[PDB]
């Protein structure tokens, strides 16, 4: 089965809180063939607002998406046509959450 980055692999619910599932969910997600994480609704929302806040307060005048879309320095000779939509956060099957 193909799995792309940002896709929930398994979902759980019930009369419980995070840490209870988080134990064995981190245990499973460590054993997955890719990088994975145990997330909640709250933690998933928190990381998404964190990524948007980092993109908003980034003090670098130059960004990957600006350079790629404007074809700055002729960088599309070494980029890929998929980088126009990945915006540098993806490299092959790898997702880099530190990239803005």
């Amino acid at each position: 089965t193909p799995v792309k980055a940002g896709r929930l692999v398994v979902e759980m619910g019930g009369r419980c809180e995070f840490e209870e599932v988080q134990g064995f969910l981190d245990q499973v997600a460590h054993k997955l063939p890719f990088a994975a994480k145990a997330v909640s609704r709250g933690t998933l929302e928190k990381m998404r607002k964190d990524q948007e806040e980092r993109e908003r307060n980034n003090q670098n005048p130059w960004t990957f998406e600006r350079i790629a879309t404007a074809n700055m320095l002729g960088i599309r000779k070494v980029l890929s046509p998929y980088d126009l939509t990945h915006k540098g956060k993806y490299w092959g099957k790898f997702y880099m959450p530190k990239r803005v």
Partner: protein, 120 residues
């Protein structure tokens, strides 16, 4: 595959902050471009080499005048990573016939019509 790049018009819309960053009034736009090739056409596609040859920028660091019209602008938009573009400023107006042989271009991009080689 690697092909020609269509640059967005959102890239080529200027902003007021850009205007005071590089002072140029949106109304009364500058009339002529001073274009200077600052990079090699080697290790670049043949269409960029052809547009460099069309614009007359075969020799590096040699300024050339071009019109500020949309077609020439489209060519410069294609080849914009190998050149530097400045506005041609005319402090003492256009050169006349009597002032044709005493001109200079200068680094600031101002075509002076009197060149005296004397201190002020």
């Amino acid at each position: 595959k690697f092909t020609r790049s269509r640059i967005p018009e959102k890239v080529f819309q200027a902003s007021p902050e850009d205007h005071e960053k590089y002072g140029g009034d949106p109304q009364n736009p500058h009339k002529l471009h001073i274009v200077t090739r600052i990079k090699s056409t080697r290790r670049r596609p043949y269409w960029e080499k052809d547009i460099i040859k069309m614009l007359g920028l075969e020799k590096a660091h040699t300024p050339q005048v071009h019109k500020n019209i949309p077609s020439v602008n489209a060519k410069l938009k294609v080849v914009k990573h190998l050149i530097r573009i400045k506005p041609l400023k005319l402090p003492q107006g256009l050169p006349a016939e009597e002032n044709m042989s005493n001109t200079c271009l200068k680094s600031t991009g101002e075509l002076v019509v009197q060149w005296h080689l004397k201190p002020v």
